[PDB]
Amino acid sequence: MEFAPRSVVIEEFIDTLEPMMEAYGLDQVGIFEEHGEGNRYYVGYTINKDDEMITIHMPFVKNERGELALEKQEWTVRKDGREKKGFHSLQEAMEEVIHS
Amino acid sequence: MEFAPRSVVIEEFIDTLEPMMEAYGLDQVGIFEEHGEGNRYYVGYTINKDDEMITIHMPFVKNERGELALEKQEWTVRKDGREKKGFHSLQEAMEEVIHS
């Protein structure tokens, strides 16, 4: 896996933020990060849809220097406190966010 | 406010991780971060209670230097995709997490 500083990864998610909000007509979205067990890491977005918080994220691996590497081309959707996987693109994840 | 580098803030939350897990008999907990709008930033924990993801967090202000400062002594509990605040300590927040 190719590792990059955390800031570089965050910036990539930030660059897609506005385009994603415009495309899906979202009013309030922010960057989401979670530090998992055993140097596992999750990065994505949290959408505030009328007081409901919906989070979508991708899996990363964190090395000794804190750098991050994308683990798999898969998005997970966290809604109502439960997670659903199997989404292979942001568009697919958003389809679940908007239409489920 | 008292600003400190993000790394310093994260490490302080990490220091309380194991003690909190032992005190409440939690099996899987990690650090949670969310970049809000404007100068808003949120830091806390996400607990995996039998597949249910429950997040608790505190409000921070991020200055132009990327540093973080605690904005208010209050915890917010995000369960089932919705948030509830008014908790003034981690103990109070956990009571909402556990006793619910």
| DSSP, res A38 | T
Q: How far is CA B5 from CA B11, B60, B69, B91, in A?
A: 10, 12, 9, 26
Instruction: Report residue B72: phi and psi, to 5°.
Output: -160, 145
Are A5 and A69 in contact, with CB atoms under 8 Å apart?
no
- Residue B44 CA to residue B32 CA, distance in Å, equals 5
Instruction: Name the residue of chain B whose CA is nearest to A82's CA.
Output: B52
- In angstroms, the CA A43 to CA A12 distance is 11
Alpha-carbon distance A79 to A40, whole Å? Answer: 21
- Closest CA of chain B from A1, distance in Å: 23
Domain A2-100 CATH class label: alpha beta
Distance, CA of A1 to CA of B69 (rounded, Å): 34
Method for structure elucidation: X-ray
Report resolution (Å) to 1 decimal.
1.6
Q: What is the 3-state secondary structure (H, E, C) of B8-74?
A: HHHHHHHHHHHHHHHHHCCCCEEEEEEECCCCEEEEEEEEEECCEEEEEEEEEEECCCCCEEECCCC
| CA–CA separation, B61 and B36 (whole Å) | 9
Work out the widest C-alpha separation in chain B, in whole angstroms. Answer: 39
Whether residue B31 and residue A35 make contact (CB cut-off 8 A), yes or no, is: yes
Q: Which residues of B touch A (CB under 8 A)?
A: 10, 28, 30-37, 46, 51-54, 78-83
Domain range list for chain A: 2-100
CA distance A29 to A11: 15
**Of residues A30, A31, A79, nearest to B81 (C-beta):** A79
Residue B37, φ and ψ in degrees, nearest 5? -80, 150
- Assigned token pair, B62: 């991020």
